[PDB]
Amino acid sequence: RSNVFAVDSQIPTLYMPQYISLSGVMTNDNQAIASFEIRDQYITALNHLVLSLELPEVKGMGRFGYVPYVGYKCINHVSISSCNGVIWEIEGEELYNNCINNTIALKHSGYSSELNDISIGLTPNDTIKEPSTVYVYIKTPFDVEDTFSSLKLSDSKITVTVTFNPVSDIVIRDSSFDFETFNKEFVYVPELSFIGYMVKNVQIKPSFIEKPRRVIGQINQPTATVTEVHAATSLSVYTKPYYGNTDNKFISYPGYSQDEKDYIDAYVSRLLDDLVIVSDGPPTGYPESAEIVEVPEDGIVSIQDADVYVKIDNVPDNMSVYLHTNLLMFGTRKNSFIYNISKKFSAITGTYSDATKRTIFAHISHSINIIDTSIPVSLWTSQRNVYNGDNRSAESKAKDLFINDPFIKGIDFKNKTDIISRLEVRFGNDVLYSENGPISRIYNELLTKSNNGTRTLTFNFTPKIFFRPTTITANVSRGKDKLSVRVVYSTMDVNHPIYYVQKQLVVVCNDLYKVSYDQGVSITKIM
Amino acid sequence: RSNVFAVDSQIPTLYMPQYISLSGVMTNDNQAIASFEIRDQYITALNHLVLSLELPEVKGMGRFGYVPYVGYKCINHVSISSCNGVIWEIEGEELYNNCINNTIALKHSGYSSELNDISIGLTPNDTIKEPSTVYVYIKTPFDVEDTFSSLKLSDSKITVTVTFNPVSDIVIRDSSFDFETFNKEFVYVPELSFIGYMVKNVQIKPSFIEKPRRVIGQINQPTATVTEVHAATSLSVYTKPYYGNTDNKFISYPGYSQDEKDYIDAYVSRLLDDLVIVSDGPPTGYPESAEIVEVPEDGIVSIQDADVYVKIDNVPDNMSVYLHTNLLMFGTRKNSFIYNISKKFSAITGTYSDATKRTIFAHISHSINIIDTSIPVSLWTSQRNVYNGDNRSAESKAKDLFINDPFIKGIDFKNKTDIISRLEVRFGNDVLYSENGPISRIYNELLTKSNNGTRTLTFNFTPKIFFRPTTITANVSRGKDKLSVRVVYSTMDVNHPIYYVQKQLVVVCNDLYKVSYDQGVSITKIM
Amino acid sequence: RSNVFAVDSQIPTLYMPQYISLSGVMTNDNQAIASFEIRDQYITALNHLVLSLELPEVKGMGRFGYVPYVGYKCINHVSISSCNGVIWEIEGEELYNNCINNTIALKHSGYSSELNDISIGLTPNDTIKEPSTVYVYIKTPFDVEDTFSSLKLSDSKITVTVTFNPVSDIVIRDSSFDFETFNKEFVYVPELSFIGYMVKNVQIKPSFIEKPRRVIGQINQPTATVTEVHAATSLSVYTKPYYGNTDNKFISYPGYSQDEKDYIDAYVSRLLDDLVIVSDGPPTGYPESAEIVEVPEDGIVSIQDADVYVKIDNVPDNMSVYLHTNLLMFGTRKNSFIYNISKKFSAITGTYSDATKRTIFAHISHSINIIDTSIPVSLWTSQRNVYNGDNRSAESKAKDLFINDPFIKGIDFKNKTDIISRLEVRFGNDVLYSENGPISRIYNELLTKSNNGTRTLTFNFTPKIFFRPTTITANVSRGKDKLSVRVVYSTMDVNHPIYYVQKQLVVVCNDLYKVSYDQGVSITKIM
Amino acid sequence: YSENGPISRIYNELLTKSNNGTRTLTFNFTPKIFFRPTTITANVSRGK
């Protein structure tokens, strides 16, 4: 019988860990680059890299806030090199995707009301935001099995290089803020930390590492190809929107609250102030194409099949209630279907306030959705629209927000709508996999215990470090050495504005490399 | 010294995985049965079964919604067989209990506002719900240790059989919905997926598997017995309510919000509209036994020791405020204690709205609880009640909801009240365990890291796959081969309606089986 | 090739577990001590200790509630001994810190609205709280590796001793409650449970255990020293506030809601009733130093550079709106800076209610923070304050609350502000580590997956039970046998009241011990 | 086999010299009567 009530305690290698901190050299649209040099013959191994960033004080007038997870979204590229060349590198988006399921890292990276609330400044000497510091955990393959997986520095020099995104990407602002001055006087201040191990009489053996590789397809094309595939462990596919042909302005943004319900409530709250107006006589200051009608005594206004129920309490006797019946409208033919935001409301109740001269709304019933909240403003007024699209007031038009978040997926802010209806993967010339529904995404989320998975084919099911990984292997004789992907996009109604948002296909492939430790660190591609 | 900075990488067996999808055959109260046939000599092993289901479009008038986790609650039975007979089977409730701690699986199975909100239809051509698809992860013993635990198909035919519950169980509806037509036209559409492994020169060895077995006791009896117990790893006990002697109608249901506070708020909100009435003269349309009194100037109404504080703002000068002092009442003797829902309120404030002709309530102080929210409507008006129980208006009575959820535990919707005060377990003739408090439930939750544990005795503490499991073993000579359970139910007040809800005892025992792989797959009970 | 599709099932040692429960002996400011005796020659091992506590019924008048996690916060000290002396002991605070990341244990220990809401009693026979029971999971080193790590009772007697805190520490109450009677009649009722293992022909081997050791520094001194350090695995540092020179009264407490936003909202809600007053003529009943001014027609009141915007609807025609412009004020010089809570508000809106004769506030904009919510009341009126600090009404002063929570860290209730700006650790005479930012706290939280880490140096990275732990080792020849810590506290503004809160430094060191099993259990310090 | 456009119909019409072909997969290209026809053959072991 095997003893399950006692073990023989082994004596491990003698070692001692130490926390080490390093400052870097900054060089320069003058993109910023930081280089860190690690040189000590007693540092045998290292892992758990952490980058710190100091954000400065912001003063002035206007409305201003930071995007969520600013620390992660400010990183463009990370590279680790030695004298024999690059050992490992990754783009920022792949790091974000790999760390998306680590709530503690996300919270440390910068997620709070003080940072993400949309603050207001009244005078040129008002302080909008106080200074603070964020920390970005750079997860690497060397962390998966603590000491067993650490990187051994066989008496070589290691260089870490971090490239930063321009500061315009991480800021949410309105047109009143003095962005040119802010951008001229903003500077990045970084610092790198890691855990080192001092080892006595180490015995080194070769090991194995995986390197991700990204390919971006052409605009609106439904194909992409990865060449020189000799040993891959997985393949991932997703899409990105391209907003380069707009001015990047949006009607609303919820800030710290990030639920779907919060997005919808913020949008509806921004529209309600202009949708129902209490005025003495016909309201002035609107474009000529506005159709503002008076609410009857029974409270029901008909807008061609749609009925809106409006009841306001405490209305002064010298005033009346009016309804804006075409706040935003879009159509491609003069007598075809019309997308009209006014017809998405069914009941509106509230009470007028004499002290503040505005209406305080109570219960609202509506059918607004995330696509409506995600339509960009500039598409409402494009040349293909035969109507005047934006019938809002100037005060409302002055509150639009610039949003330049670089890691948006799908065609909406939450990646909720699935726009891929069929996927087909070919390895060489033969079909390797085809599916209609998102069963591969379901399987990815189940196996990785994540809420934000993507369509992924996984080929390796063996434990990571103690076994050689299982791969799909090339056959250059028959020509099986490339993976081509083809999708069919869903069909949308030609009268919905979201139909004209352009998109790009993204394919990610994980290649296998061999690590040898004679003459320092070097890698060789497995063939 | 043992090296903790390097390992020897072993070469694993050569294999290649593949995702496989299969369609099934449907046969037929004409209970639906699906059969799936797996036949390929190169599929050596499989695991991670996933079932997909397509839910259709629902049109018409009335109020309609789906129960939470509809995908799990639609499954009655799953069986896996070969030519030598059954290999593994389980009922739906045991699967649900085993998967209750997997948040990602639960969310995939169907949990969202679009599915679980109580929608309203106005015309016979209104679309209440759009079509969608859910996925049910069928967790099996073959998943616990990836490749090591997979099921080996030694050149045999494998059949999977799924039995479905009738559609009436998964729908929450009011009496206005045309359920007979919906039930006549509804059809199940299923599809099975799994991960297969193509292995080269496999070397097979025998292994071990555990099979659950459920016993259901007689109505209201506090005993149950499991026969033929020769090697069991655990024992579980819980209770179920039986609502078969009612019409299954309830006053309220919160829908997507599933907190205790949400249940209580929905119930209170449904009662408040009928509890306090603002009217010009005595309200009409109520049964003769109603006692509706006028609120005095100081705002305090006395109902025999209980005092209710009522203050309403903006009351028109031609109207008064009335209070319904016996909305729901129950008692067994003419002059004994009375359970009166009106006496559970202490303060009610709000403001009357002239535009909508209703009262908008603000702050409420009350002592309603989950048992009150869980009492079925038909028990308020049973024959043993000497009063007229339901003094609500017809409009309120028309809003009751049918609820037929099949996996309810305890006597309330959240299984919060503990109605078992003492438990005694006998193995053979001798007492094996006895307890007063729920220390076994505490231990179960601690050891399995679950929030919804049950009273469970665990006999196996060894690692699952690499060791033979530890069991309790029979001694047929002394006659130790059966487990009998006896409980004592808590004592409730004879004047509470919940006292008359019937219940059933459920016992679950996990038996051990041996798996051999010569002549395909076969099992033999360990004796 | 190694087989990854099959294993050889080993046969384990024959054993059988059993749940055992014991009652204890109580002895006696007459601090309570419980002793439990374990004596059975067939109990070979044990782990998973659980303590249960019965809380009694509380009746009377006033406001009363329990602190969160009362079960954990009621424990002062736990000790485990045999005939050879103490085997393991720990203070309550170290246990709480070790278990802080176990949500299920925390929830079982007593965390609910019924326990933690601030209830109100109206008559001397009112029932404020019903009786209930809590359970405290006493996590020990013997649990980390189930059967492998269990404690072997080599035919010796084991004694467990639990010391309890006085009941005044676990209760939150106002001055109206009859605490002297409650404290005279309260009694502790405990019971211990554990899992025992009956083993046949056990084969015992020696093992390894770690014992924590706490040192508390002197008041306001920034140094502390641990002597006799021969083999330590880690070192931790944090600070505690000392409230012994006050009366322990606070303005508000949120109860069950424990977010920062909840603290701030409760504080603001308590202040708003006294900050803005609607009255017929100048309000009476305030001290002579109050400066109450009338709000002009434009609604803007200036308080030296600060502007407050006040708009109240539905004000009766015989009444006016007044603003209290110096509710709480503190300063050290007659014409220097003043901390004035009235200047932290920028906009206040609401509606007066005629029925209840009070103002119902709607939207509030403010800059109150957690330090303001955490300032104790007695510091507002200290002798060093040259103004009259507390200008509230007597009714408001009668609602203050006593709070005596014993496990508060930092200087605020959430330990959010970091008051340590530099840390330096010396081992012997030489500097072992120094840092400016909290990178060690970041690393602690990352490595232990916790949200509430402390500044910790970790020296052991090897797996716990199967390897001998790595330690830092003394060199008595050079005199390296002591660890001295020195901090520099942050600098605060001399006109903020929080500057005068006293603090204490706490250092925790984990020493290594050897366990041998000949002649029962005994330990010997590794040298 | 999988296809998007009607290339199989084009091939059917080309090979049979017809104006009204359908989507057809042809497996036999040998002369009809003097040779045994070429077929696609089952593999009941793998279940094809």
Residue numbers in the entry:
A (entry chain O), B (entry chain N), C (entry chain M): 18 to 45, 49 to 547
D (entry chain P): 453 to 500
Authors' own words:
In Vaccinia virus (VACV), copies of the double-jelly-roll protein D13 bind to the viral membrane via interaction with its partner protein A17 and assemble into a scaffold surrounding the viral membrane. This process leads to the formation of a spherical immature virion (IV). The 62-kDa D13 protein exists as trimers both in vivo and in vitro, and structures of the recombinantly expressed D13 trimer have been determined by X-ray crystallography. D13 adopts a double-jelly-roll structure composed of 8 antiparallel β-strands.
